[model samples]
Target chain A: GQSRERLVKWLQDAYAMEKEAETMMAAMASRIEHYPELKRRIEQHVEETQQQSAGVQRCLELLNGSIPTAKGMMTDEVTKGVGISYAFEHLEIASYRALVVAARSAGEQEVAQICEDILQQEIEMAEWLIEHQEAIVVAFLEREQL
Target chain B: QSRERLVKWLQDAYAMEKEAETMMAAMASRIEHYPELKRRIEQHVEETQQQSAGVQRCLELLNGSIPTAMTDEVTKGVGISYAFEHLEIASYRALVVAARSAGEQEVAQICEDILQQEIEMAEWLIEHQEAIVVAFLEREQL
Candidate 1:
């Protein structure tokens, strides 16, 4: 009871969490102009994040978890944007880590696999963000902003 | 300006660790089906406790104030925690930059050392999580 109910709730949270990231990443990808590399990578990851949400949805279906109907929206600062996104990746990593365990412990092997794949993606993105963080922050400070 | 920002950010880092200690403690207490997960959380909790203190000392060395939790049971808690670790990782990264900018090399060095431990914890969770899930499942079924 404890495992399944909380597991289902968290799976729902994880899915909602993905939607928020999708919205946030798309916004970043669209508006960012200074860093072509960052913008390009954001577009790429937004696509992957799209697939990620879909996979999370499938997991929800298999486990009979509630699907969040409202596409979650997020709404943050420019340089602080980098910090928040980096933090968000870790959030997804943490969220999916729970999903993997909760699903498998509840005997949903397929669901666990989906979460695992998503977790890896989040970890990769987090690494990318870290790699580029100094540059982005420097770019912000070195240049005058509106 | 760098010193000002450095002190402010250091305080933020200190505050974050205080929150972290709370989160880790709460999560560790709730976990039962997974001993390794439990103990690992326990270990990190202890590390976090000292880290907040260390951050406080960093503040003292530089001359600052500290600030302060959230939760659920094991599943949500641990998931939140995994993500929070990266949040800490990111914050510490920023701290390194600020410390360097302030010419406080010692503080930067300390932040880096703490950052490594956070990274290690995240990596451990990643590498061992599948086994952890399996272990939890077996225990739950019994």
Candidate 2:
């Protein structure tokens, strides 16, 4: 009973969360001008995030709760921006993974797939971070003279 | 003296609530044109205070004291709340799992309530993103 409520709540939340992700990623993409490759990757992910948000909206529509309207706050660590983005990617991954399980349990096969799409993108972003974080951190710290 | 991991997390959560309160209040003051958004942030400031108190109560139960100072100043407000809420949810979720693993059911139960609140708060913010965006868009158009 409670689990069902949690499931519905999570589904609705996913819609809002994805849009927040899109907005934050777009903001980061614009701000990361010094790191060209990272900027490009983030820019690409912003587009993907748009698709991900759309998928989430579609899922909500299927579940009969169309037009979700939530937005979230981002953060302030400018120099450690990439690191913050890395943490957020992991957060998105965890949320989507949990959502997949919850959706499947609720017999929402479509919703699970939608979550999987978003999950895969987050995994890619996180992997990129793991590979690039060392260099990025060094460069960022050096540039900031920290 | 060695402290339990759950106690450490409870302290961190308390600090988070304190910082969250500050950020919400700051954001509420910065955004003026969007009355709805400003109202939402202001309302959440009050809720954040209550949440901070709740976290403090949890800490007191564990014989812990709230920190007197917050280390960071949240200057930006764009996506900060969303990011912080995710961090809060993840921390609370892990704390809940760890508490359960340690056979501390009461601690786990206590954290779960806070986790659910974080979840709901995040969801509410998410649900209003469209209106916020649309209002901003309308402003841009005007």
Candidate 3:
């Protein structure tokens, strides 16, 4: 009862996190089919994504919130996520940023650590994507030349 | 460095290619804009579509993975639509490159011929857009 509001905020944030990650997983599955070469990368990420969601779910329970049900419920976050995604991996980056802040503010030291941990992972993901963006464009451009 | 620069330039080229494609699509949507011109532009539009597909196929062949990514379908579509047409222009802009680079007059002419057709299509679309823009301006003033 010492930090009920902060704990609830953390829980809500965790729930939001799980919701968005699941949305990304589905989006990745839909598009990765087109580029078969990235299949393994996509597969690994999918598994990582599942674990990530579970981690968030655990955080939610720790804060005493009901776990979300039904995939369709993820639609709103998914919609906003796509726009965020298109805008330079901003959504994932933002999610991690917010999660870390909320976890720390809630004074849940372990939760804060976990959030920081995943924030690093998400940043790495964004960097990796940005690194490839140019190469991919070049490859497409060269094909046009041929 | 080269790859990054290539993408930057390509984003430029693809912009025009996509526009050309859309103009062709617009022409297709309207059969009244010079029926034969419309049909020809539409044909070029389809050809550009093939070339764009070829771009992806060629990339897959080279990169061992199709690394092509676009911010939006519209970005990809419009960008390449502009690119293919600009490429067509740039391709013809090089007579010596076409003839000498290819090492045969026939090959050069063939390349130029296709490019010339593409250029005509681009010009037609511009004139069409201008006419529409002017007509709209007049109506607004009225």
Candidate 4:
């Protein structure tokens, strides 16, 4: 069972993340120089991100919660962004760690399972980013040398 | 002598980055038409950010900065997307080979890792784009 406190915080965090992602998408679009494939993705995401942001905003509004539009992003605030993302996942993991505990607490095993799915996706995203660091750095090195 | 050689190698490494960046920026631009693919490129853009920072740091170690105010002709040729894809595939492959030949095992591994992604990205573009292009051509004939 989410300590009503944790649930609220998680909701707010998700709200902010969606907004941050959308705005960050635009910022990234402006700085792009020559990578056409990269540019298109950023542009497409601008729409998807907008939709996702609005959806989150609606959810927050339905809950009578304030919409989070914090002035931060994953670019300059990477450490914080990554940290928050991990924390969000950790919260989901902890919430769904044990079926018995989750079911007993929330009386909803099905909801817990859904949480597990969300947790898994976050883990995968984190790992994917980490694995690419080496490749990314190398690519940057190639760009700078010429 | 080893230090001087390393300096040259590092300079060459920076050159490689500049070439790749130009191409990657171009690659992103070319692939923007495919929505699903364009999303996957969000990761690529972030990776580019880190790459740019890393190369600059490396260059600074050699007491040089990326040369500015030089003309690197960026001719946007659309008809050769496939050609550019092959060129990138070859370039990264060659980069990996060069890193290995240069006895830079770390750089070699790094290049190999990126080579894998570019290869995958290229394969996806080839399959998806070719299917679409073929379908259009077939429709035109019909």
Candidate with maximal TM-score: 1
C-alpha positional error of residue A70 in candidate 1 after TM-score superposition, expressed in Å: 2.8
Error in Å for residue B91 of model 1: 1.4
User: Which runs of model 2 end up more than 4 angstroms from their true locations?
Assistant: A1-6, A70-78, B1-142
Better of 3 and 4 by TM-score: 3
Query: Which 10 consecutive residues of model 1 chain A have the lowest summed lDDT?
Result: A71-80
User: Please, what are the lDDT tens digits per residue for candidate 1 over residues B15-130?
Assistant: 78877887777777777667878889889888888787887888887766565421345544555666678778877887887778678898888899899989999777767655
Task: Please write out the lDDT profile of model 2 over residues A1-146, one tens digit for every residue.
Answer: 43344455666666677677778778888776467888888888888888886787777666666567665561214334565576587557656766776676667787788888888988898679657754654454345432
Which is better, 1 or 3, measured by lDDT? 1
Considering only chain B, what TM-score does candidate 2 achieve?
A: 0.78
**TM-score between model 4 and native:** 0.36
What is the model-wide C-alpha lDDT for candidate 1? 0.74
Q: Is candidate 2 or candidate 3 better by lDDT?
A: 2
Two-way DockQ contest, 2 vs 3, winner: 2
Mark the regions of model 1 whose C-alpha exceeds 4 Å error after superposition: A1-11, A27-34, A58-66, A71-76, A94-120, A141-146, B63-65, B68-72
Q: Which candidate is the best by DockQ?
A: 1
Name the candidate, 1 or 3, with the larger DockQ value.
Answer: 1
Candidate 3, which segments miss by more than 4 Å at Cα? Answer: A1-3, A33-37, A71-88, B1-142
Model 3 TM-score (B-chain only): 0.44
TM-scores for candidates 1 onward, in order: 0.76, 0.49, 0.42, 0.36
lDDT to native, each model: 0.74, 0.65, 0.46, 0.44
Each candidate's fnat, in order? 0.57, 0.02, 0.00, 0.00
RMSD of each: 4.5, 14.6, 17.2, 19.7
